[PDB]
């Protein structure tokens, strides 16, 4: 919805559709008829402590199928992607 491209270069540590972040790999973390639908953390292989409390975004797809109430009508992951996907495409998988 807005211009937020100046964070794809963030590697270490809101009404729009996608939260693009394909270059963030390590985290330590010490109406609503048109909302966010894609958590774009494609290259996320080390969450350290889980601490995952993201819930009830009402449209967030591909969060139940990611192995570490959000979206109940979602498209399937790529069958080559074997059901661990951050998105609908082959390059949107997970490794853990």
């Amino acid at each position: 919805n807005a211009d937020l491209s100046f964070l794809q270069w963030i590697r270490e540590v809101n009404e729009f559709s996608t939260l693009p972040l394909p270059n963030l790999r390590v985290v330590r973390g010490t109406n609503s008829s048109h909302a966010l639908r894609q958590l774009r953390l494609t290259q996320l292989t080390e969450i350290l402590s889980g601490g995952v409390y993201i819930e009830k975004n009402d449209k967030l797809c591909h969060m139940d199928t990611i192995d570490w109430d959000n979206g109940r009508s979602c498209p399937p992951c790529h069958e080559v992607c074997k059901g661990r996907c951050w998105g609908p495409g082959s390059e949107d998988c997970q490794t853990l």
Partner: antibody, heavy 118, light 108 residues
Framework: QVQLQESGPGLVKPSETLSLTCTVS?????????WNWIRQPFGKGLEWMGY???????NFNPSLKNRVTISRDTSKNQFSLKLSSVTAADTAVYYC???????????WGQGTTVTVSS | DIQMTQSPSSLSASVGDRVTITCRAS??????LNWYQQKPGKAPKLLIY???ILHSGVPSRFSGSGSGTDYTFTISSLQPEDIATYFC?????????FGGGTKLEIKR
């Protein structure tokens, strides 16, 4: 197996209210999905009235304000669309469709033809 | 407010030739763009959802491209089973508005 089908009267006077009912014969209605109404005037594009989620929400498409209403029954899988005070421009083919987040429409039902005149 | 254009509009093309139907959004954000194929007298059927990703059961012949606003429906080799009207879509707002409809006619 998901299938949608619509029923209702053919004509509607500009004084009465047109009522259409969409039923899902695939028994795929959960407290999950969005089911919406789409309009096609003859030789024109596709408009979109609005949807009803699992909870249910008010009218959409601000162009169709105070005219499009959607209801739910949960007994025999009925979603009733009412457009009140038709203004003779609603001579169109109507579709009831499913929804989601990425691929917006999946099955589309079949569509019924409605002509508005006296 | 909202607008949605499909460029080629009427489009002739022969059997077994690349076809590009260029869409547009007039919205800075339309990452989620779907391509439908509506046969004459039938309901629209889903071909592509979310730009590139093809929908289940759709032949891999159809493909999609484009990032910002300029989208592109490509057919690698047109066949006489493709003469339907090809529609666009967007999802970023309350109305999921479609395109004007690009009529594809095979030039036999």
């Amino acid at each position: 197996q998901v299938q949608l089908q619509e029923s209702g009267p053919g004509l509607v006077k500009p004084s009465e209210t047109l009522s259409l009912t969409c039923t899902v014969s695939g028994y795929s209605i959960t407290s999950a999905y969005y089911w919406n109404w789409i309009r096609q005037p003859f030789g024109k594009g596709l408009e979109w009235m609005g949807y009803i989620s699992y909870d249910g929400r008010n009218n959409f498409n601000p162009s169709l304000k105070n005219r499009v209403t959607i209801s739910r029954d949960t007994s025999k899988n009925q979603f009733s669309l009412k457009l009140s005070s038709v203004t003779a421009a609603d001579t169109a083919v109507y579709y009831c469709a499913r929804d989601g987040d990425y691929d917006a429409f999946d099955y589309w039902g079949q569509g019924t033809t409605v002509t508005v005149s006296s | 407010d909202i607008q949605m254009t499909q460029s080629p509009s009427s489009l002739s093309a022969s059997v077994g030739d690349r076809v590009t139907i260029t869409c547009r959004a007039s919205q800075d954000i339309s990452n989620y763009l779907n391509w439908y194929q509506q046969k004459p007298g039938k309901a629209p059927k889903l071909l592509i959802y979310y730009t590139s990703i093809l929908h289940s059961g759709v032949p891999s012949r159809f493909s999609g491209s484009g990032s910002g606003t300029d989208y592109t429906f490509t057919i690698s080799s047109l066949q006489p089973e493709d003469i339907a009207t090809y529609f666009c879509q967007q999802g970023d707002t309350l109305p999921p508005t479609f395109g004007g409809g690009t009529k594809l006619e095979i030039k036999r």
